Design a protein around this ligand. Structure first.
Ligand SMILES: [Cl-]
Length: 256
């Protein structure tokens, strides 16, 4: 904090939630108008859920000296240049690293002034997380037989937009449907995909090298918990693979 009376924003996200260097863009608003430069770069060095953010040099947001109130919004991951009108363009074609496509928005924090400059940003994911666990039936196949299994999801939209000042939901901008290869780490696969009103036509493909590269297909819409992909949710699938085919158990959770 300065020693010549100016009151800087004290930003927090209030064990392994963030990673050192993670950056957010903050806006201080007077109604709909951006007060000063928007998209101010703030970073964290803390990993904890209650981690504090620090302004990049020359990016510090100061409260109005007249003690009038302002509102605050933020988004992750920070982009130096947004599309015209404070718009974040989503592209989920490239899955790795997951953190670089994990778009999050902080709920608007209203009516703050220099007498209480602490703003606790609560971020929510704007996209959808897929968390897949693969296991063998233990009869026709063993977990060892599934070593190297790859996972992909079909007929995906890959482009969306999000206004970082407006908040609310991301909007899918329809284009040509694509197969998205999910990131695998042993018998675990993960992905970040766009929200979808219907999962019809979407299938998970499991290519098992052990079974001479044989591919198993499973319809996402056949699961009880995923007739749609809801923004800010995590879909957990447990895939049991047998020579006769695959079986899946599903769970949906708020993504946290
Ligand atoms: Cl990753």
């Amino acid at each position: 904090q300065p020693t010549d009376g100016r009151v800087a924003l004290e930003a927090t996200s209030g064990d392994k939630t963030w990673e050192a260097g993670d950056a957010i863009g903050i806006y201080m608003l007077n109604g709909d108008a951006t007060d000063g430069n928007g998209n101010r770069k703030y970073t964290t060095a803390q990993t904890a859920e209650n981690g504090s953010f620090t302004a990049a040099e020359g990016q510090t947001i100061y409260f109005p000296v007249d003690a009038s109130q302002r509102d605050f919004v933020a988004y992750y991951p920070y982009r130096e240049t947004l599309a015209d009108g404070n718009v974040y363009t989503v592209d989920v074609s490239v899955q790795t690293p997951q953190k670089d496509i994990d778009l999050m928005g902080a709920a608007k924090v209203e009516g703050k002034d220099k007498t209480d400059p602490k703003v606790a940003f609560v971020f929510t994911h704007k996209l959808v997380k897929l968390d897949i666990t693969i296991k063998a039936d233990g009869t026709s196949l063993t977990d060892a037989d599934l070593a190297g299994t790859t996972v992909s999801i079909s007929n995906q939209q890959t482009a969306a937009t999000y206004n970082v000042v407006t908040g609310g939901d991301a909007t899918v901008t329809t284009g040509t449907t694509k197969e998205i290869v999910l990131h695998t780490d042993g018998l675990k696969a993960e992905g970040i995909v766009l929200p979808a009103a219907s999962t019809a036509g979407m299938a998970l493909t499991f290519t098992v090298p052990g079974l001479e590269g044989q591919a198993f297909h499973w319809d996402v819409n056949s699961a009880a918990q995923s007739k749609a992909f809801v923004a800010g949710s995590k879909y957990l699938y447990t895939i049991t693979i047998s020579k006769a085919g695959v079986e899946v158990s599903s769970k949906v959770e708020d993504w946290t």
